[PDB]
Amino acid sequence: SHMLREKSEKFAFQAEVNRMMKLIINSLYKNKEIFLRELISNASDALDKIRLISLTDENALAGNEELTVKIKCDKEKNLLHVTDTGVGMTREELVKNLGTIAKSGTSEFLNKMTEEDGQSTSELIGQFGVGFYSAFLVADKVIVTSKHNNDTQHIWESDSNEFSVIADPRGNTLGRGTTITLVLKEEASDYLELDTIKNLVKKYSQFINFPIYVWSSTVWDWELMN
Numbered sequence: 001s002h003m004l005r006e007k008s009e010k011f012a013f014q015a016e017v018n019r020m021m022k023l024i025i026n027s028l029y030k031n032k033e034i035f036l037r038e039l040i041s042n043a044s045d046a047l048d049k050i051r052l053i054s055l056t057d058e059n060a061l062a063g064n065e066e067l068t069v070k071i072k073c074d075k076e077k078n079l080l081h082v083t084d085t086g087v088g089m090t091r092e093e094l095v096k097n098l099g100t101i102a103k104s105g106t107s108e109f110l111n112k113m114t115e116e117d118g119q120s121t122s123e124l125i126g127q128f129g130v131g132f133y134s135a136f137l138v139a140d141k142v143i144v145t146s147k148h149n150n151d152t153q154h155i156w157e158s159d160s161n162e163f164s165v166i167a168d169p170r171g172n173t174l175g176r177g178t179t180i181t182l183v184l185k186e187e188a189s190d191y192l193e194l195d196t197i198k199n200l201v202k203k204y205s206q207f208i209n210f211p212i213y214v215w216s217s218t219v220w221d222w223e224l225m226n
């Protein structure tokens, strides 16, 4: 419209990355803690996907009949867990979709991600880029435990430079869905406190149609946060 070849995937990737780049900076200038918001939204979207799938595939929720989001803090082990029972991710998705983005130099493999899928690098960046990279505002590493209906449970790790994926030695523990694990920095220890997580979760979960729980306490159990 004002530049050459704006319809190109090269331009679409740059425009999407610029958009994400501006969303994270703007959040840092106003201090908005978008990552947990993005995690709850991204978990809700995965539940929407598997529920849309269940509308046509009768045996889609067989691995896990509940549609929840469960957030858990491990102040001892310094970990943040966001677990959804959504569509889940196959190993192919973790490697060729998320892995291609997480691995450095993603802009080299734009045409490799173009050869009809309906999921291009720029589209994946616009959909999941803000949530993925805002996690590195508070975390040093992102570990993804995911079990899709058409694959076995895998575990996937990245520091936004390299990535690695193995099969879960524990087997099929999720049934279906994804657990996002953030290895938070020491300067992000505030988000291991129950009160700040419960408050932030209830804020971002007020308008979510899916039940969202937080591991709360002399006995611990899942607490409804609406």
Ligand SMILES: C#CCCCn1c(Sc2c(C)cc(C)cc2C)nc2c(N)ncnc21
Pocket (backbone or CB within 6 Å): 042, 043, 046, 084, 086, 087, 088, 089, 093, 097, 098, 101, 124, 127, 128, 129, 130, 131, 132, 133, 135, 142, 144, 177, 178, 179, 180
């Ligand atoms: C790229 C790509 C395709 C992957 C799509 N995708 C993501 S991306 C993401 C990850 C892996 C970790 C963080 C901290 C944030 C984001 C946004 N999360 C889920 C999910 N829970 N369920 C189903 N699909 C998901």
Ligand SMILES: [Mg+2]
Pocket (backbone or CB within 6 Å): 001, 002, 003, 006
């Ligand atoms: Mg233009």
Ligand SMILES: [Mg+2]
Pocket (backbone or CB within 6 Å): 118, 119, 120, 123, 124, 127
């Ligand atoms: Mg897409």
Ligand SMILES: [Mg+2]
Pocket (backbone or CB within 6 Å): 159, 161, 162
């Ligand atoms: Mg590295």
